[PDB]
Amino acid sequence: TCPFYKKIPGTGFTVDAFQYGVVEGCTAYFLTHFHSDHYAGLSKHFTFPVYCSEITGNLLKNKLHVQEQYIHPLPLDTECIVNGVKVVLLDANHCPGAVMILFYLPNGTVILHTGDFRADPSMERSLLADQKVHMLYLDTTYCSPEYTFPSQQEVIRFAINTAFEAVTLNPHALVVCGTYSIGKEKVFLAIADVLGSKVGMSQEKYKTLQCLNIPEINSLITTDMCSSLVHLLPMMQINFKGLQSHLKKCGGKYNQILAFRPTGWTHSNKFTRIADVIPQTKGNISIYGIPYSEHSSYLEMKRFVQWLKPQKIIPTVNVGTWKSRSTMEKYFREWKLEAGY
Numbered sequence: 001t002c003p004f005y006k007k008i009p010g011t012g013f014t015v016d017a018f019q020y021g022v023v024e025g026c027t028a029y030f031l032t033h034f035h036s037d038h039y040a041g042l043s044k045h046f047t048f049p050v051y052c053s054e055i056t057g058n059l060l061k062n063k064l065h066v067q068e069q070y071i072h073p074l075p076l077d078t079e080c081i082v083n084g085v086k087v088v089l090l091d092a093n094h095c096p097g098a099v100m101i102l103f104y105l106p107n108g109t110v111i112l113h114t115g116d117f118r119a120d121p122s123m124e125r126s127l128l129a130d131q132k133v134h135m136l137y138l139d140t141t142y143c144s145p146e147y148t149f150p151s152q153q154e155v156i157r158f159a160i161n162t163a164f165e166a167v168t169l170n171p172h173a174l175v176v177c178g179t180y181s182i183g184k185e186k187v188f189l190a191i192a193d194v195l196g197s198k199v200g201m202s203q204e205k206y207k208t209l210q211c212l213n214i215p216e217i218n219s220l221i222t223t224d225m226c227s228s229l230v231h232l233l234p235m236m237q238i239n240f241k242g243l244q245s246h247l248k249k250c251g252g253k254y255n256q257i258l259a260f261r262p263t264g265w266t267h268s269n270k271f272t273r274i275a276d277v278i279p280q281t282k283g284n285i286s287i288y289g290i291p292y293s294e295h296s297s298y299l300e301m302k303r304f305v306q307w308l309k310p311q312k313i314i315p316t317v318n319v320g321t322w323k324s325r326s327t328m329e330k331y332f333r334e335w336k337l338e339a340g341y
């Protein structure tokens, strides 16, 4: 059964609620983004209306085979009426297609659901500038001050410079990048662009990327592994065994691998600056863990919420323990006493 923090009071709507069967009184199911924890339950057998972005809609149709008649894509930044209620979708700065949803309730209340997001100062000049929010349903993934990490731009600068140096020193090195879901595509796209290569991958992954409305994509990716010196592999293969195994398949073209494992936050962020990051190495294989996050840092979250000044906050992540819930409520009260709302 569907938890409270996935329901929108005074509407027939739910958000990211597909794993509970038929939800009593739900006339429209919203999907914030195409990540498995959030879509859990959708398939070709689904027969209720799904509201989402264009990109999420392309993924539902081609990857999960949801029938076209039940897919309702909405443009961003545009007032839309759904089942008699005004809604707006806003870019969440998470993975491709990910949105926040603004709901203008019939009684005058205004609710923002962030989905998953990476807060940014640019969001302070969206359609949120105008107005009051009475309830914030907040992505609290990294809601504690210990969670620090660099900007995406600094992390990509590090990856580009590391890959370009290694291949210029050795033209016979291969570069490998781990993936398991959508999101973080700048990591392998930026590396391939500096090396003058297309990105090689399986047919399954190529199909997923073809759904994402990325400009000039046909010029950037391929299923012909032999033509490419940047390869994508499932994330589970990014280890010395899996990489040795991969180098055997490449027909003596290559004598070295440099691999990247994008992660979220790890505890080595508590000590090591991005500049100072070093790899794990065995023989002719080196593996870099790089902290490329698509969720808000503590400081980014705090800034956004202090700007928005919501009357009530409902967390949607880390809700399962008394200690987590208590910790988050403590920080929401500090932020409010500090800023005066």
Ligand code: NI
Binding pocket: 033, 035, 094, 116
């Ligand atoms: Ni997500």
